[PDB]
Amino acid sequence: AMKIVKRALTFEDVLLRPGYSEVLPKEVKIHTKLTKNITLNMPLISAAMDTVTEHRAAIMMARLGGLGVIHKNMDIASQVREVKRVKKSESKEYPDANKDNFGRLRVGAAIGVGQMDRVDALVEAGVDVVVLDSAHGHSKGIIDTVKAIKAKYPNLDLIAGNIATAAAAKALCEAGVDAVKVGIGPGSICTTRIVSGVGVPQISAIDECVEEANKFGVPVIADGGIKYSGDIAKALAVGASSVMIGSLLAGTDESPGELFTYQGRQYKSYRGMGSLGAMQLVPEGIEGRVPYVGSIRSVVHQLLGGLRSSMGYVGAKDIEDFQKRAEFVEITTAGLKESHVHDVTITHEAPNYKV
Amino acid sequence: NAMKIVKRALTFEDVLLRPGYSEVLPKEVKIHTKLTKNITLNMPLISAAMDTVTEHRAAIMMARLGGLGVIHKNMDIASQVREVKRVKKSEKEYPDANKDNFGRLRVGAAIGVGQMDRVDALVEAGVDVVVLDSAHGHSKGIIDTVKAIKAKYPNLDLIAGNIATAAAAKALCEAGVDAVKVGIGPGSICTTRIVSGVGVPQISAIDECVEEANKFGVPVIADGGIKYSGDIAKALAVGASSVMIGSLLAGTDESPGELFTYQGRQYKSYRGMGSLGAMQKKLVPEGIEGRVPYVGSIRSVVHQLLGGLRSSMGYVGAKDIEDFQKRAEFVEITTAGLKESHVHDVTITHEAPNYK
Amino acid sequence: AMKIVKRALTFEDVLLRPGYSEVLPKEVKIHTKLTKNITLNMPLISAAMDTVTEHRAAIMMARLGGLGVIHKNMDIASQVREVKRVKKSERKEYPDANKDNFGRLRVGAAIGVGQMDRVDALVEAGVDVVVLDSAHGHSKGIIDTVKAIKAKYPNLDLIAGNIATAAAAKALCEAGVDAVKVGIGPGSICTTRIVSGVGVPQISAIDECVEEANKFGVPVIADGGIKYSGDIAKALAVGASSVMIGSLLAGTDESPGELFTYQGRQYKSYRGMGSLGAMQKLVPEGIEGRVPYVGSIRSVVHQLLGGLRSSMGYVGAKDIEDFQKRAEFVEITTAGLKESHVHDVTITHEAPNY
Amino acid sequence: AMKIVKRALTFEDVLLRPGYSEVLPKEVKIHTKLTKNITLNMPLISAAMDTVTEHRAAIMMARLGGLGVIHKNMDIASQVREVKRVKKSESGKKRKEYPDANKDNFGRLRVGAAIGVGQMDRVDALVEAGVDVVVLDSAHGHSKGIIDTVKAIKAKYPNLDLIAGNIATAAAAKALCEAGVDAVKVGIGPGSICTTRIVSGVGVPQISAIDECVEEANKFGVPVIADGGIKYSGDIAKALAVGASSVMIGSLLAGTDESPGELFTYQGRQYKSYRGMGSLGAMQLVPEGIEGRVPYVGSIRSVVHQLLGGLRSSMGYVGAKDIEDFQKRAEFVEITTAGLKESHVHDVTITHEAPNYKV
């Protein structure tokens, strides 16, 4: 008989229970670790996609206290030129900016397997973290590349992904990564589970990996499938240390894509890295568009705002406390229906709730 | 799993009441109940304390029909006092009117954390019950406000919420509330569960809190998420002593606001007190601004709601509410079993007062 | 600390498992029992509603081997008039006709609680079976009416409902019914579960009652919520001796009423008996609606029985009794129901039984 | 209580867990067994449907490593002439163009043909024509008629490979294997155009079906053909991972150049007819299928290419070097409705249409 290992939950299967609280939303700390050695002032990372992060968006992210990861769908020269543009910028309008020993904004940069020349370049341009991202991080090529980079650059922080199992986490942490990115399938533009049948719902994914990663003191980045600030709060409460976000940031002033107008409204194009457009045979992503939403800064303000309200409901003074206090319930579909807005036509724009 | 999953929580659509042997007719069942340890209603419905649901005009009908309205707090003390008095000075056409020892209509009024000056005035205006409402009742701010008010006015009935766990019900009771409001996120216009990830489906919430509050002899008000008369019946069957309703009352004559037209039909604004527009009188809302259909008079709406409650009780075979809770037994259903429970496979021609 | 008795399934939650078959669908027997003393040659009863059954439809149902029930939304004499027309209607064309000992077609008639004078007039008129219906058959009003009727007319077969629990099934059988009707809230036009919060999904409710009423040898009629022919078969495989149908027959020629056109398509009016229009400070438990016009009753019934026979063929059963002994089910997920319907394919030509 | 045997899962109910992988999608081998004795170089069979497979369609599938099955909705001389067109296509240029072609010992493309119950005179004419495998298909394979026909064919033609379906239970698999079949076709209800679960209430969800028959048919060393319900390449992968040895597909191949029938335009878009064999139009009366249309999707070669590409990717995710390793390594999770909505595309309007994702 076939081997079913578990019944796996995603964000919409669970809610956080309220607990006794002596703290206010504005008082809670959202400091967090990005890797074993790098912290963040806010727990959000903009995704390493050509429709999301480039030098401009990586600057806002650091200024607001998180990070952006320059994508790798460009030649070595260009990624160096984008990284240098983040290191040359600077931030009182930005009190929580995420800077380095020289007071320069932190930035990350993506690489593929066996791309040493690119790591060589990014390291000398001053990259703070290298994000080795694959469609399948639990692979011999990725482990080999991890050990080879930690040999050459022992002081360079390295993030590797994407994985979705305790086994994958143990293997990477043993190869010496400084954080693991978790997510096979969750992303809004991802078709992997449909074209290949592979994937693990993200809440169960994060839960499986944090349990293994913690044995190594290795932070877990929850990558993909965030649709609302609440999904962030669920991701952090299960034990992830930071969240990587793409779709919610691509419709902003700061993302690389150009603005255009279709049938009255303004959009930006958003596409998967594994889609046909971005690979120019058998794609695993789609090409789409998202509505224009304004500045990154305002989108980010609402997401963190919801994280803060969540921590106040749970009663947590900081992220680590959040994770000790968190208790969940599993809901049914009808419970999801009641969690959303029901039986009323929305008539004004809500800044943190659309459908 | 290394994450703490406490239970699997059900809401109104996951369950149905099993019919029982019945010796009673729906017209002969008694629907009186308790709002609080010392205030009784003749029927178990309360108006939400919302600036699109309850004001003096709506609060009067609710009292006249046997229930109670809670005047909302989105106004200055002077105005809210004035709203409270219009109801008290209102005073065979309404034979189930819910009155006080002097024979004035009963009325409620909402308050927030540490608004002690607001309470001083509302007591002097003769309010019967002060509703200490907050997004998160299970907090030091609310506990301390409870103990403070119960120290200053030991005979003023206090309601506090909203909660959704036994631990919370326990805290408020020992702080001395006379009734708890249960409901974190079921509201039609609520986005709490989405914007913050916090919530408990309402049926598991009620059930959990009633069990705890009963130990203290404290009634439970089921707040929000009620879509049809049947939910009012489910909610009471689980242990709630009364139900508070928003969107089903916002489209009426007696709610504040004015009617407006959109593509041939008439509507009324309806919005969360956590919405941008309501709060503006930078913000991270937990509500939305919407409209609902104009549905005529509150009286028509309360008639149908209580009508289906009386129908339910007849099916269960219960003479009064407290018997309805002892006899009631539930069936949990699947999603497809609800497709069958609504109307299905047939196009509706004429509208039904009780069903849209 | 609330009382959740079980998890209740409806038709869409189950499927029949195939079995070894030595039988072909043309050659399986679909006779059954309506009551303790009245048999049917096919297991279908047309519903007792003012938009479904009247004499024109009851005559057809009996000619094809089933039975119609004349609805109670009319004065006594007018109901007497309808039953008499069915009775006096009276071999190669309709070989499977369901007749009484006098060669006349069989007919039922619906009555309400406490309506003894109507019963007398119907017994006088030759009604084979009286169907005493209520929103809540498990009440003192209905039990006392059963006891009274059975006392005055012992040899008159009586049906009572609707009910949805074992305990209710026991009470009706002890009061002397000759059948029970199961169905609280599965009806296509029924809003009971929304208005009162009261119901039991049909497959679980049939299961619970059938077990109980077999102890007395009382057939169970499965009432309401039949959408397709496969639900006919699921209803009987679980234990029901017959099934009652409303929506699938309201859009026929014999259904009482006249057709009307809305947006270039033809329709029949179809309404619940607890709707505002069937009654006229009232609190309805049904809606007023319309169903597409689907032609003759004979064409609809032929497909319905044709899916029952085929189902028997899959399970491998010579008759309904064998069908119930062999039937095994699987429970499916909402996803498994999408796959069991047509998916991914626009349907160009509409099917007769889909 | 009514006898409820289990809770049965369909494809959308499960996902494969990735494992440690040392293989690349392009290096994994996808060869598989069709019957106890006939091999395939790819695991896809085109369905025995009068709008899916005929000689043109059968040829292209053999060229790519798979197999076609010529439908039986035609007279015997018609079916024999179409079986021959495949066998003639190559005798012994197009061997370097289709290097993975599925050939017999004579070098001709392999071909299947469908028969109904008690059609021995059809079988005779098909065997003389050079058919490689005869598939005895029925709405209900677990029946006396199918099993006696299986006995009669294997007695008259001992060395002729025979597939028999459709079944959905271990008991049925046990019966057919014991009657001496060489493969079983699993599938009651899952087909895109089928209405058997709706009209007759009968059927088993396809993942559980495959799982129940594989466990039994393996005891006899007999392969399972997972037949119907495939809407995406990932379904092929799941069906194989559960233990099926090959997959039969109708809907995804009916809108192709090779498919029988002709193109037509309806509101400025091009479609092909695609109907269930139990539909009213297909039976020249209580149907068990409907008559539909499918978007035109160009050549069978490009369709097959994406489908196999998805499978290879799935294999790379699991780390498996061949289909046997895929099955010994595979582990699943069960998912909820919200997990399936997460697994698809969500919140983004698909502007460009992907060659392997259409909703």
Ligand SMILES: C=C(C)c1cccc(C(C)(C)NC(=O)Nc2ccc(Cl)c(N[C@H]3O[C@H](CO)[C@@H](O)[C@H]3O)c2)c1
């Ligand atoms: C986020 C997604 C899905 C995405 C992003 C960009 C592109 C892609 C595309 C659409 C190209 N798909 C994959 O590339 N699919 C894939 C599937 C299974 C495996 Cl095993 C592998 N190979 C892994 O094994 C090697 C180590 O040995 C690694 O280099 C890596 O290639 C790849 C997908």
Ligand SMILES: C=C(C)c1cccc(C(C)(C)NC(=O)Nc2ccc(Cl)c(N[C@H]3O[C@H](CO)[C@@H](O)[C@H]3O)c2)c1
């Ligand atoms: C009905 C809802 C949801 C609503 C209505 C109007 C406005 C609101 C707003 C949108 C303002 N949201 C909250 O206020 N969210 C909130 C979340 C967590 C916490 Cl812990 C707190 N703080 C609590 O602390 C004090 C006691 O300690 C209480 O006053 C309360 O402030 C507030 C929401």
Ligand SMILES: C=C(C)c1cccc(C(C)(C)NC(=O)Nc2ccc(Cl)c(N[C@H]3O[C@H](CO)[C@@H](O)[C@H]3O)c2)c1
């Ligand atoms: C098919 C349905 C649902 C329907 C059809 C037409 C009309 C109705 C109406 C809308 C009238 N609803 C009921 O009548 N609801 C009801 C609910 C609970 C109880 Cl307890 C009772 N009382 C029963 O007790 C007496 C026998 O004991 C009966 O006369 C009856 O009155 C009635 C409903």
Ligand SMILES: C=C(C)c1cccc(C(C)(C)NC(=O)Nc2ccc(Cl)c(N[C@H]3O[C@H](CO)[C@@H](O)[C@H]3O)c2)c1
């Ligand atoms: C793929 C489907 C569903 C299909 C394809 C073409 C046509 C059909 C039709 C629409 C004609 N329906 C059936 O034929 N329904 C059926 C149902 C139950 C049983 Cl038991 C049987 N009998 C089977 O057992 C005998 C053993 O020898 C066989 O001859 C065979 O007749 C048939 C359906």
Ligand SMILES: O=c1[nH]cnc2c1ncn2[C@@H]1O[C@H](COP(=O)(O)O)[C@@H](O)[C@H]1O
């Ligand atoms: O095309 C691809 N296929 C599958 N996943 C992708 C692809 N491109 C990016 N991703 C992942 O999807 C994430 C974005 O998910 P989203 O924020 O939910 O839209 C990124 O952080 C990547 O990890």
Ligand SMILES: O=c1[nH]cnc2c1ncn2[C@@H]1O[C@H](COP(=O)(O)O)[C@@H](O)[C@H]1O
């Ligand atoms: O905007 C807000 N955010 C969340 N909940 C709210 C907000 N405003 C009102 N509520 C709650 O929603 C209830 C109304 O629910 P309704 O009956 O579904 O419309 C009120 O009784 C309040 O407890």
Ligand SMILES: O=c1[nH]cnc2c1ncn2[C@@H]1O[C@H](COP(=O)(O)O)[C@@H](O)[C@H]1O
């Ligand atoms: O007005 C009503 N309210 C609730 N149930 C009804 C009403 N009228 C008829 N019914 C039931 O619904 C059944 C028909 O349902 P259908 O076969 O699904 O259309 C009838 O046989 C009655 O048992």
Ligand SMILES: O=c1[nH]cnc2c1ncn2[C@@H]1O[C@H](COP(=O)(O)O)[C@@H](O)[C@H]1O
């Ligand atoms: O008319 C029919 N009724 C039920 N199943 C059918 C019918 N015609 C073909 N099938 C089956 O459905 C399969 C096609 O499924 P598809 O791949 O989802 O379109 C074929 O392989 C047959 O086994």
Ligand SMILES: [K+]
């Ligand atoms: K809500």
Ligand SMILES: [K+]
């Ligand atoms: K219904």
Ligand SMILES: [K+]
């Ligand atoms: K189907």
Ligand SMILES: [K+]
């Ligand atoms: K996805």
